[PDB]
Amino acid sequence: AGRFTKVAAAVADSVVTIESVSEGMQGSGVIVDGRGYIVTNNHVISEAANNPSQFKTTVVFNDGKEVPANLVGRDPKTDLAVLKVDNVNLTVARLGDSSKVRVGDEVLAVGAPLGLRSTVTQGIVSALHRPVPLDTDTVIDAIQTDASIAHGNSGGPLIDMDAQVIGINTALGFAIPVNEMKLVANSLIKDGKIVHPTLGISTRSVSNASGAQVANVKAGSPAQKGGILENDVIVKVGNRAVADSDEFVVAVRQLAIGQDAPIEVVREGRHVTLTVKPDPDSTLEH
Amino acid sequence: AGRFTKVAAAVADSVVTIESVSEGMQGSGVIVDGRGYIVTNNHVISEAANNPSQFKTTVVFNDGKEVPANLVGRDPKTDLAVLKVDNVNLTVARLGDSSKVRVGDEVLAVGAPLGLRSTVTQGIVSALHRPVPLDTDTVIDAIQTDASIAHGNSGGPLIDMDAQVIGINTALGFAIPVNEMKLVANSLIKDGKIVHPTLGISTRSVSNASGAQVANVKAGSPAQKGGILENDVIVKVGNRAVADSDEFVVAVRQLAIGQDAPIEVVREGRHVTLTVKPDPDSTLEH
Amino acid sequence: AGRFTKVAAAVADSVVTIESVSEGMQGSGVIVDGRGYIVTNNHVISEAANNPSQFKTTVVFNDGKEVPANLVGRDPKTDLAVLKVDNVNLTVARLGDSSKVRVGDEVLAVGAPLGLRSTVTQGIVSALHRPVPLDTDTVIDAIQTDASIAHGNSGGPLIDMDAQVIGINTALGFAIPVNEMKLVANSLIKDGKIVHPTLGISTRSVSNASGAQVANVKAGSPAQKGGILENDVIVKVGNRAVADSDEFVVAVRQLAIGQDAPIEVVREGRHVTLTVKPDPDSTLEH
């Protein structure tokens, strides 16, 4: 048994096929809780959550066993989604620590074994916390990897050499970190819904100071009250520095809701600093 | 000497350049028999076997030595082909076992060293027995690998870590399993020709039960006598289950010729079961 | 710490971000001399050397420290370029030996860590001395690798397993060998300019003898005096054999300037042999 052959064998029973039929779409997912909670990506079941009348998500295990599915919740802003299999034994995956992942580590982008176009690709960690563009469109602070990510392993986990989940694949290959995955899944399980910060700002990238040049501020938004104007260039949102519009959408998510936060920007070349109170995007869930 | 550096060095003298000139086309191949039998893929020499008057296939070894070639036989249905070098010493490759290959094993997609666009790529086994579409067109029950397969290593072997051939490259990278390779090469050497099963059925894929929806049945075919109609959906051919039209063409090849075999299909949603006697595709060679 | 994780960690401080602003363009480079000499590729700073009035190349280290840059020299014919950081401590990279590199060795295509689209890809050596086509356009006798080369690691080094530079990345992935890199950088530092051989010949590829069919000979060139005509097919330039026009441009560079050299060619199918005295491309620097 080789190095990568043993890792894919242990975690295989913890990887699952996810398919919604009507047509049809198929994907992958990982078993993260013994109660029957399976984590996938939102675009896999995105067609099962916008059309619930003509679709029926099913769960195919590694041993061929089928079972119905139950959508616990999803998060299109970080492209995560949690499913439920009631009264199923269950091979629980081992969840890793994304903060301990370093550039250079060997990883495995596992897909569901019984899948039609399943993959199992191997690479290393090419980048950490890379904002990548990807139901509302979004951008994620992802783990980059030279292991190929396609329809096969999309949904499946990004496994380290200790057979532990360092991320969840999404579709030069990118994965959502496991630490951002656990936080979203822990509040998608409990609260059935996540609440992300918001400032009400449409931005565009620039490369001249660079950053996210503001396009349109929402009327009544926290940004409109903190003094952010159009045409200024956001160079730092809070403790994070903003390199372009892709990193701008990711920086606002790490801001505490209600806590007044600083936002540095350059308007007419002149560097101003701006205080904003991040609103919740879900006024009914917060 | 590294791990992959030693494997490619031992098997290098067993990998060969194959080139037909007139324009011209070049490829790769492996030495599998001491008598001078070299295995390649059919599309490499496909232009040397349909135009034998304006072409002349030649064999370039790792030590630069050239020699003429002799087409023993080919199989476009599994994209295999065997050549012959008379009175040549000869580095015989070690043939592996495809059934022992597991997802995760490190592999090497070797190409002919002296080739113009030669490659030597490294990956793992991404999938086993994946029907892939690819002279009559066909589909093969291939070994998938994340190692790149291109014009360089096309023809060359897919080598495991024990420096043993687990497959032969063909042109997200796919290879023909060595066990299906040996069987085809053993009867392409002896009988000079392979004979594959046939039922006389044109099929199309569907994803609603799914499977291979039948398009046109050949008049007088075994399928026309066993009761298979048009518009029904083939869900299983024999002991194999049919997921789409690509897997359908692969399942019929494993059926014994003359032996009555079952074929389950759904016509008007109603699941019927059908007995068919697979014909040989070569009535003169069987 | 994994195998590839330790190699990328040691050499990380020796890899540098290179950016010219006005927009703007960013790249990568390696620290090869303690005096502050940083090597990159010419197309990275190509916009900083043709437009010096509206651009300002800057150097960002791994520890975030910025510093201005100083163009010591560049070579578009082998796509190399050397920069200068005065009075900077400095993590000097360990330079490897390209002649000791064998097909199969694990390599790391490192990019600048703080880069916007930085990569760190891992592969093996797929080919040695592969002429690849790539300010005057050119072709290089490059190291091929299955590790992905993109805008991220372009400029950065191709690191072996001993944390030593075997090449410099350029943009199925290719790198300029470190031995050809040192020679160009040693005379780009000293003489501020490289001088490459020239014969005055425009060639085109052919695959029938094959080689580089001559298109246009420059009036007064060494080729026009040694007896090379148009329409003949160059099959060998010196000790090198010419397989196509891409290898032809690389073979002339290894010829000594002034030393009469042989050039074998086939005109009307008849094999002639031709003596040429390679001119310097820079009559003022030689």
Curated annotation (Swiss-Prot), chains A, B, C:
Active site: 43 (charge relay system), 79 (charge relay system), 154 (charge relay system)
GO cellular component: peptidoglycan-based cell wall; plasma membrane
Subcellular locations according to the entry: Cell inner membrane
UniProt GO molecular function: serine-type endopeptidase activity
Periplasmic face residues: 1-283
Catalytic activity: Acts on substrates that are at least partially unfolded. The cleavage site P1 residue is normally between a pair of hydrophobic residues, such as Val-|-Val
Keyword terms, alphabetized: Cell inner membrane, Cell membrane, Hydrolase, Membrane, Protease, Serine protease, Transmembrane, Transmembrane helix
Enzyme Commission number, as recorded: 3.4.21.107
The UniProt record lists the keyword Transmembrane helix: yes
Domain PDZ positions: 183-242
GO BP: proteolysis
Membrane topology category: Single-pass membrane protein
Main location as per UniProt: membrane
Keyword Cell cycle tagged: no
Quaternary assembly: The C-terminal region exhibits both monomeric and trimeric forms in solution.
Family, per entry: Belongs to the peptidase S1C family.
Protein function: Essential protein that may act as a regulatory protease that is conditionally activated upon appropriate environmental triggers.
Record text about domains: The periplasmic region consists of a protease domain (PD) and a PDZ domain, connected by a ten-residue linker. Interactions between the PDZ domain and the catalytic domain lead to an inactive conformation.
Identification of the protein by name: Probable serine protease HtrA1
Naturally occurring in which organism (per UniProt): Mycobacterium tuberculosis (strain ATCC 25618 / H37Rv)
Lineage: Bacteria, Bacillati, Actinomycetota, Actinomycetes, Mycobacteriales
Whole-protein coverage range: 226 to 528 of 528
